[PDB]
């Protein structure tokens, strides 16, 4: 359950113990239980002396365990610039992929190591290489809020609108994670603000979903469509009203988003605020424009949706403003019949 002695000497950078061990056992590529050579441990802790000692005794600079993590991968992930240089000088392969198809550039960009990424690019690393999910290094840089890494990769002609398997652009990832600085750099460099995901989600839709207000303002300022709909017809106010993010719902209504838009299910933003139960969104949706007695599929008012879930503050806001209890669905169910049912 203890590491092999050459792995322990690698972690401690003990070149004297390593020299004695290699004199006794001439194999520098001894495997641990995980399958990692001592060169992998030296690359992780940037022990350059024991790394050169191991490489001078025949250690495989391109050793590939079962998971595909070469020492160059570890050095790039850990930010070991000097170890990356040493491994590249001794013949490390620049395009080798892990089990999940990550290149060393993927590991560098995911952790935002600008210097290492530039060294790998200058050595010919593929900037458009993809993982199993279709993530390019710029996707990993945008996911980690690594502004200078998005900035360097864009300088090296990375595709600003590359898509994953879920049709996610780096702008989509930035909107998802709330990184408004990455989104600002991408949009100021020509990224399309109305890119569609697999379900037709724009970056504005995702920003309105996750209550990322700064990304929302940046997108709307860089010409994102405020009335863009999904495959299901969801506007950004449908997403904001359903998720309950009052900052987004007020910002979208101050800018002139129609609070009376519909979806495949003829649902309006006040219907989704009644079904979820956000009485401060609904309150704003009415204060502005929104039809308290508006109807959807089956002839359902927001009073019906609020009475189904049993929210009384919502019922009491809808009923106080203009809601009429006597309105009934196609099956004849008033809000008093749903409330009696539940």
């Amino acid at each position: 359950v203890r590491l092999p002695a050459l792995h322990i000497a690698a972690r401690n950078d003990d070149t004297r113990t390593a020299a004695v061990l290699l004199q006794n056992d001439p194999n520098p590529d001894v495997l641990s239980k995980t399958g990692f050579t001592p060169l992998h441990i030296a690359a992780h802790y940037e022990n350059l002396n024991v790394a050169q000692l191991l490489l001078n005794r025949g250690a495989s600079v391109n050793f590939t365990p079962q998971n595909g993590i070469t020492p160059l991968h570890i050095a790039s992930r850990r930010g070991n610039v000097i170890m990356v240089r040493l491994l590249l000088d001794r013949g490390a392969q620049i395009e080798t992929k892990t089990k999940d198809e990550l290149t060393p550039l993927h590991c560098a960009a995911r952790n935002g190591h600008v210097r290492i990424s530039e060294i790998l690019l200058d050595h010919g690393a593929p900037i458009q290489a993809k993982t199993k999910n279709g993530l390019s290094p710029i996707h990993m840089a945008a996911q980690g809020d690594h502004l200078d890494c998005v900035r360097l990769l864009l300088q090296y002609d990375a595709e600003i609108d590359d898509i994953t398997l879920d049709h996610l652009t780096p702008l989509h990832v930035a909107a998802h994670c709330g990184h408004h600085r990455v989104a600002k750099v991408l949009l100021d460099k020509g990224a399309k603000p109305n890119s569609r995901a697999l379900n037709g989600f724009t970056p504005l839709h995702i920003a309105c979903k996750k209550n990322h207000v700064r990304v929302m303002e940046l997108l709307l300022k860089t010409g994102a469509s405020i009335d863009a709909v999904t495959e299901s017809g969801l506007t950004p106010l449908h997403v904001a009203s359903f998720m309950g993010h009052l900052p987004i719902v007020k910002n979208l209504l101050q800018r002139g988003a129609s609070p009376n838009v519909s979806n495949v299910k003829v649902e309006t933003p006040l219907h989704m605020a009644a079904r979820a139960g956000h009485t401060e969104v609904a309150k704003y949706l009415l204060q502005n424009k929104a039809k308290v007695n508006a109807k959807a599929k089956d002839d359902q008012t927001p009073l019906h949706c609020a009475a189904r879930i049993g929210h009384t503050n919502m019922v009491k806001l809808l009923l106080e403003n203009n809601a009429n209890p006597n309105l009934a669905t196609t099956a004849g169910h008033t809000p008093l019949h749903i409330a009696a049912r539940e």
């Binding site: 792995h7 995980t34 990550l102 995911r110 379900n199």
Partner: peptide
């Protein structure tokens, strides 16, 4: 203390094998 990193379990935890994998591409279906 000061000798835990010499064990295979601690080293595997230290090497962070999950950081060399594509975790997921979440969508959060509404």
């Amino acid at each position: 203390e000061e000798l835990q990193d010499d064990y295979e379990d601690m080293m595997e935890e230290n090497l962070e094998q999950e950081e060399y994998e594509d975790p997921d591409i979440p969508e959060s279906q509404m």
